[PDB]
């Protein structure tokens, strides 16, 4: 059972992206992590998953940004990036085609 309280996660950009993609951002639906690249900075933290909502970035409240503004925050957060994330797989699963949340709380995509 995957903890559902908010968490603080620090990522290190170095020489690449942060290593994840984001979806959502229409009409305050929120901004959700959709994909984490293996070996990437997000992956290297070990703390982020597909289905997390990004609540803030370097303390800037994101619960209601557009996708464009999430991406600018993220790009301009510099080298050490602090994220408050919270796992919301049911809300996430409505964004991904053919996806659902099993009884273990994991996102599955048929």
UniProtKB/Swiss-Prot annotation:
Modification(s) after translation: Palmitoylated. Palmitoylation is required for targeting to postsynaptic density, plasma membrane and synapses. Palmitoylation by ZDHHC2 occurs when the synaptic activity decreases and induces DLG4 synaptic clustering. Palmitoylation by ZDHHC15 regulates trafficking to the postsynaptic density and function in synaptogenesis. Palmitoylation may play a role in glutamate receptor GRIA1 synapse clustering. Depalmitoylated by ABHD17A and ABHD17B and to a lesser extent by ABHD17C, ABHD12, ABHD13, LYPLA1 and LYPLA2. Ubiquitinated by MDM2 in response to NMDA receptor activation, leading to proteasome-mediated degradation of DLG4 which is required for AMPA receptor endocytosis.
Domain PDZ: start-end pairs: 8-88
Tissue-specific expression: Expressed in brain (at protein level). Detected in juxtaparanodal zones in the central nervous system and at nerve terminal plexuses of basket cells in the cerebellum. Expressed in cerebrum. Expressed in hippocampal neurons (at protein level). Isoform 1 and isoform 2: highly expressed in cerebellum, cortex, hippocampus, and corpus striatum.
S-S bonds: none
Subunit structure: Interacts through its PDZ domains with ANO2 and NETO1. Interacts with KCNJ4. Interacts through its first two PDZ domains with GRIN2A, GRIN2B, GRIN2C and GRIN2D. Interacts with ERBB4. Interacts with KCNA1, KCNA2, KCNA3 and KCNA4. Interacts with LRRC4 and LRRC4B. Interacts with SYNGAP1. Interacts with ASIC3. Interacts with SEMA4C. Interacts with CXADR. Interacts with KCND2. Interacts (via first PDZ domain) with CRIPT. Interacts through its first PDZ domain with GRIK2 and KCNA4. Interacts through its second PDZ domain with the PDZ domain of NOS1 or the C-terminus of CAPON.
Domain notes: The PDZ domain 3 mediates interaction with ADR1B.
Cited function: Postsynaptic scaffolding protein that plays a critical role in synaptogenesis and synaptic plasticity by providing a platform for the postsynaptic clustering of crucial synaptic proteins. Interacts with the cytoplasmic tail of NMDA receptor subunits and shaker-type potassium channels. Required for synaptic plasticity associated with NMDA receptor signaling. Overexpression or depletion of DLG4 changes the ratio of excitatory to inhibitory synapses in hippocampal neurons. May reduce the amplitude of ASIC3 acid-evoked currents by retaining the channel intracellularly.
Family: Belongs to the MAGUK family.
Designated name of the protein: Disks large homolog 4
Coverage span on the entire protein: 306 to 402 of 724
